[PDB]
Amino acid sequence: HWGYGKHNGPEHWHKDFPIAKGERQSPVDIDTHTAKYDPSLKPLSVSYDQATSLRILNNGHAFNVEFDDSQDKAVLKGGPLDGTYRLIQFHFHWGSLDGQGSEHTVDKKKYAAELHLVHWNTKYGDFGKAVQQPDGLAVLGIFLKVGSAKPGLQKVVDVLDSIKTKGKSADFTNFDPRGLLPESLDYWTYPGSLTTPPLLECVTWIVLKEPISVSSEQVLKFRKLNFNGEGEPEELMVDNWRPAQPLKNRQIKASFK
Ligand SMILES: NS(=O)(=O)c1ccc(-c2cn(-c3cccc4ccccc34)nn2)s1
Ligand code: NA
Ligand SMILES: [Zn+2]
């Protein structure tokens, strides 16, 4: 099966998932000089006041913090989007070293990590349906640099010891994802895909310009997770990012000048 190793990593994925070589793959490099300001874009609307977190799961390639998406509770709207998108989960991608780990890059700069807040378009009724549609998902991507600690991340960091290995989960109620956002909601947007198999071309990407800062100790703790299951040889969960893919016939739009 697929993963992030020499023998099953991103260069291999196309054998099982040929859309790996498709026309709207993610992530991409964001060339800031070529992205055009689009004054027709709206401010984003991030409405997380009623978000209801449930659980945190090590799924063997990241950890997902899962939300109750059975009603409109935590929704993303505006920006480039038509309609209402419901938060289902967030996760991260990160490196073995502070100088790598993001999936998107900015003028070829790699950040230490990247947060993905995953939302599905309510007009399609459920996530499973939405992922089959070109406008099914909206993923809010936020870069992480290493510097000062992010206080709102610490509850995440503290639970990781209890989900060390693939298949483990833990209660994760009453977590407020507002505490992971930067000050500014300035963003880039473009049409793309899931960054993990099955690589479905269903995502409107919204990538915030302002990174959040986390401490070296917070990211060190991410790197103590395991890709393996319990009782199996230990494989540290690091460098779980896909590299930048060809832009092809796409424009990246800026919400700001
Ligand atoms: N990294 S990402 O934000 O692009 C992302 C957000 C959501 C993803 C995802 C992958 N999924 C799947 C996993 C395994 C099998 C699946 C089969 C069909 C559809 C999605 C599948 N479901 N959501 S990947
Ligand atoms: Na419900
Ligand atoms: Zn992701």
UniProtKB/Swiss-Prot annotation:
Substrate binds at T195, T196. It is found in: Cytoplasm; Cell membrane. Zinc. Can also use cobalt(II) with lower efficiency, but not copper(II), nickel(II) and manganese(II). Changing L194F: Normal activity. The modification Phosphoserine is found at S162, S169. Optimum pH is 6-8. Changing N64Q: 2-fold decrease in enzyme efficiency, as determined by kcat/KM ratio, and efficiently inhibited by chlorzolamide. The active site is at H61 (proton donor/acceptor). Interacts with SLC4A4. Interaction with SLC4A7 regulates SLC4A7 transporter activity. Interacts with SLC26A6 isoform 4 (via C-terminus cytoplasmic domain). This is Carbonic anhydrase 2. It comes from Homo sapiens.
